[PDB]
Amino acid sequence: DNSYKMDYPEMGLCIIINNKNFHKSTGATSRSGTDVDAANLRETFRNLKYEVRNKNDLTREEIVELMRDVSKEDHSKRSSFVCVLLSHGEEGIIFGTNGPVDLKKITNFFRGDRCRSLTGKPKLFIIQACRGTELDCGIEHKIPVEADFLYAYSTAPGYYSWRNSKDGSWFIQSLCAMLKQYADKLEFMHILTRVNRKVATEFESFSFDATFHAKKQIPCIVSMLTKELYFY
């Protein structure tokens, strides 16, 4: 009623796009630590009973193709859809291994009118990627075709997003931990709010470079959801 119906036969797909190595000509660095993310996400969403598909090092053409194909599957027996993007990015943009693609192009395949078997079902996009280059220095009869999307961004509009080469990204580390701890106790927005607090309070950059040292991060929840989302 006030909650999405989550007792379809299947919870749904969880597509993880893990881009670590980029074509030399892009000038994009290797994203050390992202395999830790991809493995953590796979296990976390496995326990939430998602059908996880891990994909690694996809070109922008492969990303678009993958999303188009997945959006063309029959999702009638699935409660929801989750897509996780791990890559370089800028505001509104995610990197394939050979260059950028608009996030809007990826998510449009799942619009209420373009993926009918997901109409009315929660479509979750989890995005670990920069949204620009700002640093946070810290202190002290019809439904909309855009309805039932949630975008869980790792960082605020315009800002870098931080990834630790050993531990994985701040956001994915915190997201998986909070899901593991609270998916049986809390509605999704309140879980994501805990993720916000964890990232904001427990992480701070350490760099030999003064410009990049002692910096902070706040994730950014963007919800067009129309109901509460419970994983139990």
Binding site: T29, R31, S32, G33, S87, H88, G89, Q128, A129, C130, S154, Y160, S161, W162, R163, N164, S165, S169, S205, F206, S207, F212
Partner: peptide, 4 residues
């Protein structure tokens, strides 16, 4: 720590 590195940025994406």
């Amino acid at each position: 720590d590195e940025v994406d």
